[model samples]
Target: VNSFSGYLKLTDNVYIKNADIVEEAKKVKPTVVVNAANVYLKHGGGVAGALNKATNNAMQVESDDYIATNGPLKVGGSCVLSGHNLAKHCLHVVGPNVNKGEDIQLLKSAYENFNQHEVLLAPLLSAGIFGADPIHSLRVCVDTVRTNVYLAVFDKNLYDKLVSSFL
Candidate 1:
């Protein structure tokens, strides 16, 4: 497929790309894949929706169970799901609404809490329906992980912007 990719040296390894997130996730076979979700563990929209479909809705089930056992997740809170269709595990993080700069810090918190894994696949957290700017949100994701992060972007314009900034 057609895509652009590169690496950034922030703290650890950050791999950025403009491509289909599902395809990238499949190709990378990451140890853990992150799902940007709401507090209710709803995976009916945005990246979470796509991930729900990709994993055969297993993520939704697990997340629902987590919510049932635990209370509704707070922003920046996270839950993990294993035996997923794609990655060995999936990290479901409650992303912030794109209003104030809180989204940025909350997104970082999600990444910081991620379990150890060889490779982690993530989208531009809080950048989609959540309303955060793509580039700035991506920077936060990179900064938080400070290790191996695979950023999948589908928009050509956004991809170009990221490439230009990093290159």
Candidate 2:
């Protein structure tokens, strides 16, 4: 009996392939990109992870492109200024020694810049920089994106509400 086809129709209309995530940054030509990392400012070890990601992608991580609200420097951390071909510039923000903040303020800053025609690509949750899990990161990242366009790496373990709430 065909009562209501709209209610019964169920099919996988949407699919996600690894190819979809391929770097299309070149196409967008964004003014700025924001990235978050869980790095040790005292010894400066966390920068490696960021460099690794960029290097593997055949992209250079420039100091002017990096901004850390916590860790070594607070508010506006000093640039590593190593001038390493791999490491151009670095900015460390002040964060909790053992555990850094959710980086809410930094997220806000990124979002605000969107008003001026900037886009924010934040890789925050992967390193546990915000908290021990993705839920916490989603909470903080989603909230701060109120005014701007934000593209976040989704954490499957976290509840969908955490994302929908912000959207």
Candidate 3:
């Protein structure tokens, strides 16, 4: 289970920083774990794109080892995207659109679903806006959804450090 640093290095964009990944993996809690975090902010189509991608990607990311997946669907619908990978006991949630008030509602629903089902939900995509600063999107998501969630962001090291507190 102890892979060389080279193997860990190969998994790009899997962690917020090399240190966090290394520290979390090295801690002795009787078990070691590694999670893959790949958040894609589908643009142009807005919330709808995120919804379609969530369900579509969930089907592809399905595995026996996964537990659950969560996010908001495209704006303007109560679709409440949900799916289960029976073998892995995983649940996938594509959230509502990010540009509307419903995002809060959707996030609340996602949390309820995840907690009610005893599943851990990762944070949604942060820092993505079409004509605006990417960080704005992240700000909105965090401000709206307050929980112990992992944020997935895309930016250079400089920007990452500046916005580390938000994530």
TM-score of each: 0.82, 0.41, 0.32
Model 3, C-alpha of 125: deviation from truth (Å): 5.8
**Per-residue lDDT over 1-167 for candidate 2, one digit per residue giving the tens place of the 0 to 100 score:** 21111111112111111111113222333233333423333322343344435445333333323424422334222233332323232222222222544444444343232333323323443234433454444454445434333343433443344444433
TM-score of decoy 2: 0.41
The TM-score of candidate 1 is 0.82
Which candidate number would show the highest lDDT if scored against the true structure?
1
Tell me the lDDT of model 2 at 118.
Answer: 28
Give me the candidate number with maximum TM-score. Answer: 1
Can you tell me which runs of candidate 3 are displaced by over 4 Å? 1-89, 99-103, 117-121, 125-151, 154-163
Q: Judged by lDDT against the true structure, how good is candidate 2?
A: 0.33
Candidates ranked, most accurate by TM-score first: 1, 2, 3
Residue-level lDDT for 47 in candidate 1: 86
